[PDB]
Amino acid sequence: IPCTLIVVLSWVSFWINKDAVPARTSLGITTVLTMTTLSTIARKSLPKVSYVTAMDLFVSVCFIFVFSALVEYGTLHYFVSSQPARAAKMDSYARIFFPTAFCLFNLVYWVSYLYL
Amino acid sequence: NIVMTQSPKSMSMSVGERVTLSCKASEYVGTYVSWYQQKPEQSPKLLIYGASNRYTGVPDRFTGSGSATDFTLTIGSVQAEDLADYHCGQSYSYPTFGAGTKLEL
Amino acid sequence: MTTINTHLRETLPKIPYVKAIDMYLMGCFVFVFMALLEYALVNYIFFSQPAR
Amino acid sequence: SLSFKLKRNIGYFILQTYMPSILITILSWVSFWINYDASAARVALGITTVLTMTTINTHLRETLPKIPYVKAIDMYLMGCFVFVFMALLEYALVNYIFFSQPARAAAIDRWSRIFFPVVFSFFNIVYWLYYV
Amino acid sequence: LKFGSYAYTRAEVVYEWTREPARSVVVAEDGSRLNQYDLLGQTVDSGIVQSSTGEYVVMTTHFHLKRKIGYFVIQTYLPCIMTVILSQVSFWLNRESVPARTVFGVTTVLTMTTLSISARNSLPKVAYATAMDWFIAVCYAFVFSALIEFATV
Numbered sequence: 001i002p003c004t005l006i007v008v009l010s011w012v013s014f015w016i017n018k019d020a021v022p023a024r025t026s027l028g029i030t031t032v033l034t035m036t037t038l039s040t041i042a043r044k045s046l047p048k049v050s051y052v053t054a055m056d057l058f059v060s061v062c063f064i065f066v067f068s069a070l071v072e073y074g075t076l077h078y079f080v081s082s083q084p085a086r087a088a089k090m091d092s093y094a095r096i097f098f099p100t101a102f103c104l105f106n107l108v109y110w111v112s113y114l115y116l
Numbered sequence: 117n118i119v120m121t122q123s124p125k126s127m128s129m130s131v132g133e134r135v136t137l138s139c140k141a142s143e144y145v146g147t148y149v150s151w152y153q154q155k156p157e158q159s160p161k162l163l164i165y166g167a168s169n170r171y172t173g174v175p176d177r178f179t180g181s182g183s184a185t186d187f188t189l190t191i192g193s194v195q196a197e198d199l200a201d202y203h204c205g206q207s208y209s210y211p212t213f214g215a216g217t218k219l220e221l
Numbered sequence: 222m223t224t225i226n227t228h229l230r231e232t233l234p235k236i237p238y239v240k241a242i243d244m245y246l247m248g249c250f251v252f253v254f255m256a257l258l259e260y261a262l263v264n265y266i267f268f269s270q271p272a273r
Numbered sequence: 274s275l276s277f278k279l280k281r282n283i284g285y286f287i288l289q290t291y292m293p294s295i296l297i298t299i300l301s302w303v304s305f306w307i308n309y310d311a312s313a314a315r316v317a318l319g320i321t322t323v324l325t326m327t328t329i330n331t332h333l334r335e336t337l338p339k340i341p342y343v344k345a346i347d348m349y350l351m352g353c354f355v356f357v358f359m360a361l362l363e364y365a366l367v368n369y370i371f372f373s374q375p376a377r378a379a380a381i382d383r384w385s386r387i388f389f390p391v392v393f394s395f396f397n398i399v400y401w402l403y404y405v
Numbered sequence: 406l407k408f409g410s411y412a413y414t415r416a417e418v419v420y421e422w423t424r425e426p427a428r429s430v431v432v433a434e435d436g437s438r439l440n441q442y443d444l445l446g447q448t449v450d451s452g453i454v455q456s457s458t459g460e461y462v463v464m465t466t467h468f469h470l471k472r473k474i475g476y477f478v479i480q481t482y483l484p485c486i487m488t489v490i491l492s493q494v495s496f497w498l499n500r501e502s503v504p505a506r507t508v509f510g511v512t513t514v515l516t517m518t519t520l521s522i523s524a525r526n527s528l529p530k531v532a533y534a535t536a537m538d539w540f541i542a543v544c545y546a547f548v549f550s551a552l553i554e555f556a557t558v
């Protein structure tokens with residue numbers, strides 16, 4: 001629940017206008033820090049097994065999603081100064097591409113790990 | 117090797133008072149220093165073993181005081197037969213002796 | 222980076238001398254520190270000479 | 274019956290728990306000398322002081338022996354947390370009534386700047402007399 | 406490592422070393438299982454203690470340990486120094502940018518706070534101040550004073 005809500009919270013940066021640079025930047029990086037703090041407790045319960053389980057896989061995918069959101073905003077802000085009409089579609093693409101990707105991952109994950 | 121510097125090399129003090137001899141070691145010798153009193157034309161006789169332990173037959177006027185490096189031998193109210201050489205020797209390692217100290221009136 | 226390092230120190234076996242993961246974490250921290258220092262230098266030397 | 278009376282030393286507990294809390298509270302007080310138009314600055318100060326107080330509290334919850342009833346150090350930590358909370362709420366109040374009446378905002382800011390250290394020192398005196 | 410005789414006073418049972426005291430306690434060459442310390446050497450001694458039951462002979466050994474500093478350096482002295490240097494670097498930022506300097510200073514104080522909390526997880530609960538305690542206190546004071554300086558500006 002907390003990792004999923006952290007990812008859907010990091011998605012909030014997309015709807016914010018591109019001119020609020022400190023707002024979106026601090027949002028992304030603070031959700032990154034939150035994702036790390038959550039990633040700790042997932043593995044705190046288990047021994048030092050040298051393979052990828054399902055919960056550390058889930059939390060790693062969530063962290064990757066947050067990281068990718070922040071890097072997406074970074075590249076968007078970089079393209080703002082170079083090509084504005086090009087950057088105008090990146091936000092509208094991300095708004096649909098990030099939630100659908102996370103839902104597809106959730107589906108395949110919760111289906112593959114329960115058919116076993 | 118541990119060397120023992122004994123002070124003073126030669127000391128003259130009269131009869132009746134309390135005299136002191138010092139003996140400093142270079143390394144650590146923990147309460148393993150003995151004091152011998154050698155009279156001329158005689159064998160050395162042990163006075164103080166350990167660091168402060170009077171031997172069987174020595175009067176209670178001799179007292180020792182021990183440390184890790186420097187030790188003292190006090191003779192309170194010296195007498196007329198207490199004038200001889202005094203040697204300090206460490207036993208913590210293979211025994212080495214100090215240079216000795218003469219005692220004259 | 223500080224949080225990850227402290228969390229690792231808490232969760233990793235307490236070996237009180239220097240190891241390899243200590244060196245790698247120190248290198249990562251030095252890199253973050255150097256990026257911040259570079260930004261500070263830029264923000265200082267901009268207003269007078271933006272080319273540099 | 275052979276009974277002992279053990280008096281718990283205080284220097285360590287002071288150095289580890291009481292100094293950081295008071296330091297973070299004094300740090301939170303800084304947001305009053307910052308001007309009202311600096312919004313991101315005062316929000317950063319207040320919220321980061323709240324976060325630091327939370328971190329200190331939850332880490333001393335682990336450092337201290339787990340004793341599941343209320344103690345004095347917990348009362349002091351909660352007092353410092355209340356002080357930081359009140360500082361941030363004061364800033365929020367200032368920011369709210371700023372546009373409609375800036376003179377009232379400046380008066381509130383000066384009043385807080387003068388009278389939060391007073392209440393903190395009063396609470397300190399009361400606490401340190403009651404438990405000693 | 407102090408040992409001796411129970412129940413037998415100095416007049417009944419005395420102890421001694423079987424070889425020269427410098428050659429009695431022999432530590433095996435690979436017998437130093439210390440992750441943190443450095444076994445310098447041994448140091449034997451003999452004494453007489455006085456208990457309620459009499460005088461007893463006590464054979465003492467001393468193993469001399471010296472702590473390894475490199476780990477504490479890398480763990481606490483370099484991060485704290487770097488954080489304080491960062492606080493001083495915040496002075497060089499431009500003065501008309503208030504939010505940047507504010508978040509910089511306060512997040513630096515929070516970084517010092519986390520480093521200080523994690524540094525006190527290793528020290529046992531002693532009742533005085535260690536050297537790392539003084540270093541950490543001075544570093545914390547420097548960070549707080551840099552933030553106070555920014556407030557003054």
Ligand SMILES: *[C@@H]1O[C@H](CO)[C@@H](O[C@@H]2O[C@H](CO)[C@@H](O[C@@H]3O[C@H](CO)[C@@H](O)[C@H](O)[C@@H]3O)[C@H](O)[C@H]2NC(C)=O)[C@H](O)[C@H]1NC(C)=O
Nearest residue numbers: 274275276277278279280281282283284340403404405532
């Ligand atoms: C720790 O707690 C114990 C027990 O609560 C305290 O012991 C109490 O000691 C007082 C003073 O020695 C005792 O009072 C005496 O009572 C006798 C009655 O026979 C009376 O003749 C004396 O004049 C005196 O008033 C009392 O017996 C004892 N309490 C019990 C139930 O054992 C102790 O003082 C406390 N502090 C320390 C440092 O131990």
